[PDB]
Structures are given as structure tokens and as C-alpha cells.
Amino acid sequence: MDKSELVQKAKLAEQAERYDDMAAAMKAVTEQGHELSNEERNLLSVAYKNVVGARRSSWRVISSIEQKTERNEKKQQMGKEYREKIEAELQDICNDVLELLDKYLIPNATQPESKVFYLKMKGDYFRYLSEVASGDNKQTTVSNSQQAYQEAFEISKKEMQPTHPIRLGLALNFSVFYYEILNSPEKACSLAKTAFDEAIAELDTLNEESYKDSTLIMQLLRDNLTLWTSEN
Amino acid sequence: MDKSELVQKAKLAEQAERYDDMAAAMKAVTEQGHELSNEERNLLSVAYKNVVGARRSSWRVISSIEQKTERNEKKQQMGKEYREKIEAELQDICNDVLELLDKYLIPNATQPESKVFYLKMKGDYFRYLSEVASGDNKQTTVSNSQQAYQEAFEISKKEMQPTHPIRLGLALNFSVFYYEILNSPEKACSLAKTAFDEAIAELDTLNEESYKDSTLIMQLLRDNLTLWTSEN
Amino acid sequence: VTSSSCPADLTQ
Amino acid sequence: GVTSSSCPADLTQ
Lengths: 232, 232, 12, 13
Fold this sequence. Notes:
heterotetramer; A: Delta-Endotoxin, domain 1; 9 helices; C: little secondary structure; 0% strand; protein sequestering activity (chains A, B); 14-3-3_dom_sf (chains A, B); cytoplasm (chains A, B); protein kinase inhibitor activity (chains A, B)
């Protein structure tokens, strides 16, 4: 199968909502060692976000059921083991994408825009690992998520305008990392507010291609800030 | 696992929208010989319907795309091959539940209501096979679907009030079989209208538990009849 | 557009 | 349970 066939397969699988097939096809593209187009970047990201996102959603449902269940071993055992099964799937999926990013995508990125895109992804999948990790493993995933986000953040601040959707989307997810993983609401709020303020200060730089994503992300920044500051 | 643990696993999987797990759990319950409760029949039906329904939906999308792909043979060939992969999964799944029904559920059903429930399922999954079958294979699946629906229909008419959700839902699916599979709109419309009319005539038999399902199915009968009278 | 069919779970 | 919102998976580049 040549790359052109794998990409067409990924597109068909997306249309059919067969995200395992979609992710398998884009993993195969990536493992052939050549750099991705913008479209192929989005196919890879959409595929793996749907695959991991199903487990993240399932995990929250099961964890919520455990918390409403009588607190004894016979009533809790199945939910605990089932949650752990979902966690191991999530870890396998995240380890999969993180290997692709570290071995192929990041070292070979040809422009700061794609490099930031991939480092943001690396921070994301280490964040999803951190959502369910524990012990020494969690300290490692939290550290690696922070490092990838911060490196992407430094590059974006040197190379991208504050209205750039990748820079805004990075700042949004980095702020979520601070709030949800590091339990540091002050830095999270300060990062989210600054990202919004810097984009609206340079609103005249927002172009047609970016308008939809950048204004959506700006709204999510405000949505998060109201949610986060409602903990008074 | 005990039966009680499998049922608990099925309910967790349903909440988590993990329908492969849900179906595997209820398959195990079925194969462990016994007769199913009312809730277990619904868990089994919900699980396999979601598993097969994913493929039916995917099949319709890929089929559509194949149609629009005029003048590009490699795209067309890929769409064909991927459609056939989806069809093969659908066939695996239908044959799986058809074996559970034929080997365990139907021969051991104690009550006529349970027996109608399973026989309707048998008609349903042979109908789904028929949707993608071809040649002499279609002749077998279509014939097996019709016979299962017919036997369920005979039992339901003598054992159930015409407002009974299972009797109404069987008539709905049998009428869809006649219309979409057997290309017989008169039989389909006659069955759908008669089911609707007999339910209305004895509307005073509809109890609180059945109200939601029975009135929905009555509306679906009307919705279908409206559709089927455009393309008469 | 397709024909509608019965919901997968039913009151029994 | 409401959670924080994060970035959409597909971004214009």
C-alpha cells in the first residue's frame, strides 16, 4: 500500500466513523517516514483523538458510577477492574501516538508550525496519560506533558502571531493542563486570560482561514475562565 | 464469571458505550444455558443492535461514496473493497447472534412473549444479512427472515394485545422487511396500517409501562407509510 | 432516507 | 459532570 492509498483509506474510514481504521491508516503513513501535509496532520490528529477520546469518556462514566456505588469490595470490584481495563487501553493508545511523534513526526517537521502542532500533541497525549496515571509513573507523564507544552509554547511565541489557531489551541490546552493536572488555578487562569488578551489586541491579524478556529478557541478560553473562577 | 457479574459488566459497558464488551458479556450469559430475564433480553438486543448498526451505517456511507465516484477506478475499487470488509464484519456479527438465537434462546424460551422477542430478532438479523447479501445467498437469508417473522407474528397475534410493544414492533419490522427486502408495498402497507388500526381500536389496553414504546412505534408506522406513499 | 424500524429495547 | 474544554482535534494550519 502506497501513501496515497493509505490516505484515501483514512478519509473513507473517517466518513464511515471507523476511527480504529482511520488511526491505523495514518499510523502506517507516518511509519513510512515522510513528512505529513496539513491535511494528513489533521487526519492523524482526528483519528487518534477519537480513539483515545472514547476511552476518556468511558473512563469518566465508569469512575462516576464507582463513586455512586456502595463502598464495599463486592460492589466495587467489577467497576474498578473495568476502569483499569479502559485505562490500559488508553495507555496503549497514548504510547502509540507518542512513539510516532517522538520517532517520526517531531524530528522530521520542516516548519515551526508543524513542529508546534506535534509538540502540542505530545503534551496532549502525556496529559491524557496523566489523567489516569499514579505514583512515579504520573510524575513522569506530568513532567513530560509540561516539557512538551512549554517547548511548543516557546516556539509559538517566537514564530506565530497570538491569533494563530495553533498558538491559541496550545495556550488553551496548556491552561487546562495547569488547572486539571497541576491543580494550579492561578497560572491556568493567568495563561488563559493572557492568551485571550493577546489575540484580541491583535484582532486585525486574524485571517479568513483562521477565523473559525481562533474565535472558537477564544470562546473556549472564556468558557473555561468562567467555570474555573466559579470555584469561589 | 457468574451470571450476575456478566449482567453487571453488560450494564457498565452500556453506560460506557462500549458495545463490543456489552455484546460479549450478554453472549456469555446466553451460552451459559439459562433463560434470560426481561432486562437481559433488552441488554442482549441493545448490544448486538449497536454492534451491527455501526456497520450498517458505515456500509451506507461507503456505498453512497462509491456511487458518487464516477470516473476514478482506483477510488472506486478502494470503496468496493472497504464496503466488502464492512459487509464481512456485519455478516460475522449477524451469524454470531443468529447462532445464539437458534441454539440457545429460541429452543429454551418458556413464555410466548420471550419466544416472540427472539423470533423477531431472528427475522431482524436475517434481514440485515439480506440487505448486503447477493445471488443465491440472498434467497436463503430473505427466506429465513420471512419465516422467522411469520412465526413470531402468528404467536404475537394470539398471545399479545395489539398495543403490546413487541407485537407492534414486530409488525413494524416485518412491514419494513416486506417493503425494503421483498419489494412488496401492498403487503407492507397492509401490515403497517392493520397494526396501527388494531392498536388504535383497542387503545384502552395500552398500560403505563408500554405507553412510550407503543406510541413511538405507532408514529414510526405512520412515518414509514408516509415515506412509502411518495415512492409508491 | 430509509425506513424506520423498531427500537432495540422494548418494555416486556 | 462538566469539565474544562480543550482544543478541537483538527486545526487550520
